[PDB]
Every structure is written in C-alpha cells, then in structure tokens.
C-alpha cells in the first residue's frame, strides 16, 4: 500500500522564506522545501487555508 | 504582501519515512515534515496525485 519515491529539493542554494513562497506559488504547490538563508537548515513553507503562509524551520 | 507565520514541526521524534506517511495520512495532510531516522536530518513526505508518496531527504 505504501510506495515512497525519493525526489530532490528544487534548489540547494539558500533562499529566504519569501522567495520560497514565490517558488511555491510559481509551481502551484502547497508546500515547498528549501535551504533557509536564515539558518542554513531545511525549511518548508506551505499554504495555509487562510491564504497566509506557514514556515517550518528545522535545525 | 506575503505573510509568513512560523509553525513547529509536528514531532521531533525521529521516524522512518513509512511512519511519516502513516502520520501524514492520520493527519489528513498532503505533506509531512519529520526528522528522518535514516539520516538524522529533516525529511518531507508528500502525497502524489497517483497514490504514491514522495520523499525529500535533506541533510
């Protein structure tokens, strides 16, 4: 029932969250994985239901 | 403007990607961020249109 297929991060170049949202929006996706320029860690922006954007910054 | 609201990772407990898929399905979301037991890094599983699951493993 579970088939997991790896894919790659769009870009490894660090970007800030506002540029990640722009990338997400150009793709038409509801989440986007990027390397965060703030932290050099992996961050994820995502579309909230209210049209704001969430940001998960991992260490 | 782009309004970005920080949110927390669901769990900091490391897990395998097949367990992240179970979490994602339990929560009814189309992506799920987790600490990957295989890598000790941040991974993201996501729902594909074709019923399979994608995995972005970062490190």
Swiss-Prot record, chains A, B:
- Tell me the compartments it is located in: Cytoplasm
Q: Report the sequence similarity comment from the record.
A: Belongs to the HPF/YfiA ribosome-associated protein family. Long HPF subfamily.
From the UniProt record, report the name of the gene that encodes this protein: hpf
Native organism is: Staphylococcus aureus (strain NCTC 8325 / PS 47)
- Superkingdom of source: Bacteria
Its biological purpose is as follows: Required for dimerization of active 70S ribosomes into 100S ribosomes; when added to monomeric 70S ribosomes stimulates formation of 100S dimeric ribosomes. Unlike E.coli, 100S ribosomes are present during exponential growth, peak during early stationary phase and then decrease (shown for strain NBRC 3060).
What is the name attached to this protein's record? Ribosome hibernation promotion factor
Induction, per UniProt: Expressed by 2 hours growth, increases to maximal concentration by 7 hours and remains high (stationary phase) (at protein level). More protein is found in cells growing under nutrient-deficient conditions.
Quaternary data: Interacts with 100S ribosomes during exponential growth, as 100S ribosomes decrease (after 7 hours) also found associated with 70S ribosomes.
